[PDB]
Ligand binder design. Sequence first.
Ligand code: BEF
Ligand code: BEF
Ligand SMILES: [Mg+2]
Ligand SMILES: [Mg+2]
Lengths: 122, 122
Amino acid sequence: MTNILIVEDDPMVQFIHRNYLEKIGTFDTIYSSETIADAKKLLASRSIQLVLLDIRLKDGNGIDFLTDLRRTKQTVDVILITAANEVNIVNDALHLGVIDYLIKPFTLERFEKSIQRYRTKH
Amino acid sequence: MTNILIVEDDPMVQFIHRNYLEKIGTFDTIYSSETIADAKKLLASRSIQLVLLDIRLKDGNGIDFLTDLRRTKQTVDVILITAANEVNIVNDALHLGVIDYLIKPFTLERFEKSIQRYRTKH
Ligand code: BEF
Ligand code: BEF
Ligand SMILES: [Mg+2]
Ligand SMILES: [Mg+2]
């Protein structure tokens, strides 16, 4: 009863998402886009209930796309499937340029590493 | 030669950061703030080169604060020390309301879990 949009650049990963969805098998039609541009066109043209969203795409960043989705009150739910970790989001999606991201709890050694990274940066 | 601002609501954590900076011993003046408001005041008034920043504070979110710093072109380096994971950033800092956040690589089981999370939210 619900339609899915898969936004992911890697065709092998697209194949798996598609494959895993069909194993579960509870969905109507599954659309694919490798880019944000084509994702926006499909959301405008088709009725989509859920989006599986990668972050690093060829034509841009999935967090900006998701932020635009919410700004414009788009009627979709989203699941992020990505390789991105916290620092990747902070630096590569947000562009906030932090020296490091330390997950609590941290060791002294890990703490020192973050300081070395500051020093090497100057 | 480098001054530090610690922005962290938990006094024990502040104490540890302070301990570790002293052990490394290459810093001048180490300021502390438990809140964003006090951090902004210290940044406006004192010489500070590096900030150790927490995300969940009592009076707001470190990501928003970080975003303000960059907006205002504050000449300061930042290291994030926090308990926040990716989903915490996407949903609690950004407010993007994603159903789930799947880190690649994932298992079929984990994938199913994220779909269940979509279903159980109707
Ligand atoms: F390229 Be995705 F963010 F894994
Ligand atoms: F409160 Be913090 F984000 F660890
Ligand atoms: Mg990608
Ligand atoms: Mg906190």
